[PDB]
Write a protein that binds this ligand. Structure first.
Ligand SMILES: Cc1ccc(NC(=O)c2ccc(CN3CCN(C)CC3)cc2)cc1Nc1nccc(-c2cccnc2)n1
Length: 268
């Protein structure tokens, strides 16, 4: 886990900023190769949050989840991760409107593979949104940002708790219950965002109006140009009943098969 500050070189320019601190690009000297890294650098509770985040990432190993290199206590506490050069998915798609539907399916399918793994691992992400999907290439997505994530108890399939309300399942709001199934609800919002080239969901609406809309069985409409199959999958993820909502094994299989259909169409 613990890295040597002398082997880490940080760039002056920042990639992002917020209340927690900053994200910077850097280099870490590995056993032989040098490795480009993204480094979350902290501004009592905050240290514990970062260390909890590191504890979760330590336990994960999947091609579609961002890898932690380790942590370092220097000028500030730092979390050192592999770099995804193209950055957050929503910003990428906003800037690259030529990205084709097939390519979007490919990316969201990769996210569903990472989330099928996270579900198998019994961790709940709790912040699954397009902003937290990072692109290694235009054809390779990874899930990031495990700051709100929780390891489920051996005897329960949910964690009982601001909140990113527009990505939250109704039971998260009504009962404070977070499960892989609530992450599936968030994944439906993520799909919507991706097929909307990074537009924010529920435009112009307050969180409380989104909760009212949802309780009435109402849902965002189909993004321009979005395949009906993918919109149907968003609706499936937005199943109000937790038991009937698909888990990620079912979601991933639907996407996998549709992606194969589109790959076939392309060959034709
Ligand atoms: C290549 C790149 C370009 C930009 C960013 N940006 C960010 O990490 C970031 C951080 C905070 C915010 C918060 N925020 C303020 C600005 N606005 C309006 C959006 C919300 C947004 C983006 C990351 C990367 N790459 C990258 N690669 C690997 C890992 C990470 C990474 C980022 C954050 C947490 N954990 C891992 N990040």
């Amino acid at each position: 886990v613990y890295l040597d500050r002398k082997l880490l070189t940080l760039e002056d320019k920042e990639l992002g900023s917020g209340n927690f601190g900053t994200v910077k690009k850097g280099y870490y000297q590995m056993k032989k190769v040098v490795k480009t890294v993204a480094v979350k650098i902290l501004k009592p509770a905050l240290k514990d949050e970062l260390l909890a985040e590191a504890n979760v990432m330590q336990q994960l190993d999947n091609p579609y989840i961002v890898r932690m290199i380790g942590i370092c206590e220097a000028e500030s506490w730092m979390l050192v991760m592999e770099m995804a050069e193209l950055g957050p998915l929503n910003k990428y798609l906003q800037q690259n409107r030529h990205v084709k539907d097939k390519n979007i399916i490919e990316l969201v399918h990769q996210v569903s593979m990472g989330m099928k793994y996270l579900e198998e691992s019994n961790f709940v992400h709790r912040d699954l949104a397009a902003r937290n999907v990072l692109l290694v290439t235009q054809h390779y997505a990874k899930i990031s940002d495990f700051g709100l994530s929780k390891a489920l108890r051996a005897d329960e399939n949910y964690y009982k708790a601001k909140w990113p309300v527009k990505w939250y399942a109704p039971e998260c709001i009504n009962y404070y219950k977070f499960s892989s199934k609530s992450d599936v609800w968030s994944f439906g919002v993520l799909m919507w965002e991706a097929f909307s080239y990074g537009q924010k969901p529920y435009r112009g609406m307050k969180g409380s109006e989104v909760t009212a809309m949802l309780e009435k069985g109402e849902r965002m409409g189909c993004p321009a140009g979005c395949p009906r199959e993918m919109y149907d999958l968003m609706n499936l993820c937005w199943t109000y009943d937790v038991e009937n909502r698909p888990g990620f094994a079912a979601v991933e299989l639907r996407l996998r098969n549709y992606y194969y259909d589109v790959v076939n169409e392309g060959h034709h």
